[PDB]
Ligand binder design. Sequence first.
Ligand SMILES: CCNC(=O)c1cc2c(-c3cc(S(C)(=O)=O)ccc3Oc3ccc(F)cc3F)cn(C)c(=O)c2[nH]1
Length: 107
Amino acid sequence: HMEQLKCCSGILKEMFAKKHAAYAWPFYKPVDVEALGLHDYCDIIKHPMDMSTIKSKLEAREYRDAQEFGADVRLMFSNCYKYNPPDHEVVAMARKLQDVFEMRFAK
Ligand SMILES: CCNC(=O)c1cc2c(-c3cc(S(C)(=O)=O)ccc3Oc3ccc(F)cc3F)cn(C)c(=O)c2[nH]1
């Protein structure tokens, strides 16, 4: 349970790595709804999630185990698949970052 969270820090560190930056950047920080003019985001997405928030919750020991950490990572991608049209570029970027996550998470 607790032994798994040090692997979670390594996964998140890998997701913030420069080799993933071309597709990972939209997930580093919360969606800036004001800068993008997305007035309905908070009405559709009840639980916003991004990599910086997950890092804060992980350092605050808010995840009991890897499953709790993985649920927030998957909430981040699901928020993206739910809010956006399926053909939007951010959805293709979310799929590439999710492959990086799923690979390290399974291993
Ligand atoms: C159809 C309505 N949807 C959106 O406009 C929308 C935007 C985002 C962003 C996002 C956030 C920022 S920021 C750092 O300024 O907060 C800047 C750019 C962003 O996305 C892109 C915008 C245009 C592109 F062509 C390619 C993008 F990647 C992140 N995520 C997780 C989303 O789900 C999302 N949806």
